[PDB]
């Protein structure tokens, strides 16, 4: 599994800030937009993009406050990420897109799709944000940690002062051991403790046990839209998963229209780090089938 990040930096100005993105592949055709989540960056897509770049433009931004994107003094609410991602997409002048989305990247991508349904030609997704009705529906091994994350004093001490989301939670989201080179890539944007605000706000935005109520409502609405939409769908899942256990992936594979589901084997949250070749190869082949009438 490759540790390098061999992508030239591209930058675009967005609402007075600068955002970084990977941009490879041909200039024409429908672009494939890759959206990472917490606590990653476009680095998480590094071994998936090469399977897709021969046939499609691949665009992989770093969320505001993350990766190589700028770090304004925001709260980094989900609302803030929505604002910047909306403006990022318009700044590149994208028209129709295929979405490849993960974790908080999936909340951004589904929320954007719901509002721009004519511009989404397909959605590939994995370990994505859905409403978690009670804490019993959160994986037992991660319950006490995320419950502590969702406090102001203790959670900020863990995530901001002690960098637990990077040093502890992140490697706990991968079945295989991350190498020191891979850890340093994930560590790079957050070496300065003050810059770890998004890492703490994100778990406090998670729609768990009905709170925060604004995020729960928004996530419910895009899951409603997703069950209504004929858009082609590709769902990757692993065992045991974190956000999406296998029983839930099996349920969604039938309840979502026009949905193909792919078992990646063992996996927790960063499925991309456990089986990038399967995910990248299946995305590339699925993209081809989107051009077949039938
Ligand atoms: C869905 C969004 C992305 C999901 C990412 C993948 O999710 C995997 C789930 O990961 C759960 C495990 O989390 C990290 C495990 N872990 C435990 C500790 C030990 N202490 C944490 C703690 C304290 N009290 N309780 N816990 C650190 C400490 C120092 N001083 N005081 N405490 N460090 N790390
Ligand atoms: Cl999170």
Residue numbers in the entry: 4 to 297
Report text from the authors:
Therefore, we aimed to develop a genetically encodable click reaction (GEN-Click) system that can selectively target the CuAAC reaction catalyst proximal to the protein of interest and that can be genetically expressed in live cells. To selectively tag the Cu(I)-binding catalyst on the protein of interest, we employed two different methods for protein modification using genetic tag proteins. One method used the HaloTag,14−16 which can be selectively conjugated with chloroalkane-conjugated ligands. Therefore, we developed the “GEN-Click” system, which can target the copper(I)-catalyzed azide/alkyne cycloaddition reaction catalysts proximal to the protein of interest and can be genetically expressed in a live cell.
